[PDB]
# Entry
Amino acid sequence: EAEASKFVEEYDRTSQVVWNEYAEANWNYNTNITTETSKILLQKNMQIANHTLKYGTQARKFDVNQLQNTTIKRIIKKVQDLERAALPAQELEEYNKILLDMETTYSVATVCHPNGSCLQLEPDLTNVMATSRKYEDLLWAWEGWRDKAGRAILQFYPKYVELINQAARLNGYVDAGDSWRSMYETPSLEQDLERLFQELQPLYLNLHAYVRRALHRHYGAQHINLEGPIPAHLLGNMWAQTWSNIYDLVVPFPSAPSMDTTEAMLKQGWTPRRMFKEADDFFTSLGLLPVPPEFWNKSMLEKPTDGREVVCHASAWDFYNGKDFRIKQCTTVNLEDLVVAHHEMGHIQYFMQYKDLPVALREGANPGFHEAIGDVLALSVSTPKHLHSLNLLSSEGGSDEHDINFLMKMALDKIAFIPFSYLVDQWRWRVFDGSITKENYNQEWWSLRLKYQGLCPPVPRTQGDFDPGAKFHIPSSVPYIRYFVSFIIQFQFHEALCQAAGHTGPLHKCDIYQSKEAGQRLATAMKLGFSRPWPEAMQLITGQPNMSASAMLSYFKPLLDWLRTENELHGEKLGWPQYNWTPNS
Ligand SMILES: *[C@@H]1O[C@H](CO)[C@@H](O[C@@H]2O[C@H](CO)[C@@H](O[C@@H]3O[C@H](CO[C@H]4O[C@H](CO)[C@@H](O)[C@H](O)[C@@H]4O)[C@@H](O)[C@H](O)[C@@H]3O)[C@H](O)[C@H]2NC(C)=O)[C@H](O)[C@H]1NC(C)=O
Ligand SMILES: *[C@@H]1O[C@H](CO)[C@@H](O[C@@H]2O[C@H](CO)[C@@H](O)[C@H](O)[C@H]2NC(C)=O)[C@H](O)[C@H]1NC(C)=O
Ligand SMILES: *[C@@H]1O[C@H](CO)[C@@H](O[C@@H]2O[C@H](CO)[C@@H](O)[C@H](O)[C@H]2NC(C)=O)[C@H](O)[C@H]1NC(C)=O
Ligand SMILES: *[C@@H]1O[C@H](CO)[C@@H](O)[C@H](O)[C@H]1NC(C)=O
Ligand SMILES: *[C@@H]1O[C@H](CO)[C@@H](O)[C@H](O)[C@H]1NC(C)=O
Ligand SMILES: [Cl-]
# Structure
């Protein structure tokens, strides 16, 4: 066991250099797309391959079940996962071969009009989904993308499942479904997730029905059955996972602005650094670690002008060197990016306060936490109080409706995104379970689309199609249930901070600002990183060891009432018992 002690020491000492090297190129390329940087990156990819496999094979020689230093126990258990590397080289070779074929297929698939005009998934087709109100063109866009991109993925999916299942078993899991579900470190996950979902049903069903009514007056009864599920191609998003694009058709109250925050930010001279600077101020008032000085010289807060090409997905980066932390965002001076900024700083704040752990535990308490902390520090930003506190809005009449408008806009993503994020990983889990096969992939997908989102496809579909290929995270083999965890637990934290900050009354009016205790309440939680089962941190924050939806239901309580009330004014019937209806041709 003393050698096990030494082993973890060398692992850190070597791994820091390998990941920092990896990050150094990985950052350099994400900002500097120059082709040779990719070559440099790929060799570094070999090193992490060398490193991951070298120390992983050694890690499997220790028997963890006899160890009693708790830190080493979790460290070794993590490292023993060889993931792809447990596969035979031939199949590992075969596995990577398949991944790129899938990734390539999706990466170059496009929908072309009959004249040969070709539109790409982003931003081109996404603009269509967001902006068109033409039943015909939306259907064409949704149907087309699923026809060229979706159908083609059946060229690889079956063997892909078999292979990652083979890998998962060789890493000690029952199947790939077991492998991912294990990272929430809690065996009853699905049971917990199931209950969590049911507790949102009263809210979600009310919201669902109200959106349906909105669709009803724009698409008409010929395409909208007020008594059935909603056509899944109208939710304003290619996958209908986020419904915020239709807010204009769904807003409960016009006269929403007291001012245009975009125009306001311009008037006050807001700049990307100033925006992020305001975030640091909010973060500083919360007593968290101030950002390290090198950050302000190496982050990239604006679109570069030196002809470098950038991968513009905003995200946060840690170089595992206790000094280099960076944010990469094509920052536009508007309220949207202001939330993005606080979200990104949320990750950075999280990185800084677990910097004291060895690399092997430099992760969130669970995959959700890292993506959950990202929101909480941002939530207050868009509340009317905080929006006003920075004069982003001049004084407005104190209507609840403006609260309601904000809450719905929030719900139209926070809520709608829940069931979709649930369904994907359930569909995959049962496919990894072998309980679902290709012969009915499509039926299991849509059946879950019905049960969980209250959706049915716009037109009938038979085999030869494989609709799930239409969502990036599937062919890219990336899990989703973390996002579900993020959109639940973030409300527990918000309640906990508001409770600790002493705020009373409607929860959405709470503002963390300057709460010297509230910040420390999170701080002690964050420093645990990934060394502990997330229940310890969850308790340390909120006072409970389980995930609870109740915080969320209370947060949206006012919107529920107004939406629920609206259902009565229109007599809207909740649910979708009449499963089979679709828009008329
Ligand atoms: C994005 O990444 C690119 C790669 O890092 C950057 O391109 C580099 O930019 C420098 C100028 O800033 C170019 O300089 C030229 O280099 C060649 C070859 O230099 C190599 O050999 C000499 C010895 O002969 C050695 O001292 C160097 O360290 C290099 O190993 C010279 O012949 C030229 O006279 C000139 O100095 C690089 O060639 C160029 N490299 C690549 C791979 O493109 C680019 O600037 C980055 N963008 C930003 C904004 O930083
Ligand atoms: C379990 O093992 C870890 C790993 O070595 C121990 O971590 C050391 O903790 C001391 C202070 O307690 C530090 O000065 C060392 O630098 C740490 N070493 C490493 C490699 O992290 C930890 O102390 C042990 N904990 C228990 C409860 O036995
Ligand atoms: C291919 O044909 C389609 C259909 O006529 C064209 O799409 C139209 O594009 C114009 C602007 O270019 C829009 O105002 C129309 O609303 C579009 N119609 C539809 C049904 O989407 C497309 O531009 C043509 N492309 C080429 C290269 O000829
Ligand atoms: C790293 O992997 C490559 C794969 O071909 C191998 O040739 C090389 O020897 C490995 N490095 C070490 C130190 O074993
Ligand atoms: C950032 O770099 C510039 C030189 O490019 C220097 O003038 C400035 O002082 C640096 N600031 C920090 C905090 O390193
Ligand atoms: Cl995961």
Summary: Strands lie at 111-112, 118-119, 230-231, 315-318, 325-328, 455-456. The longest strand covers residues 315-318.
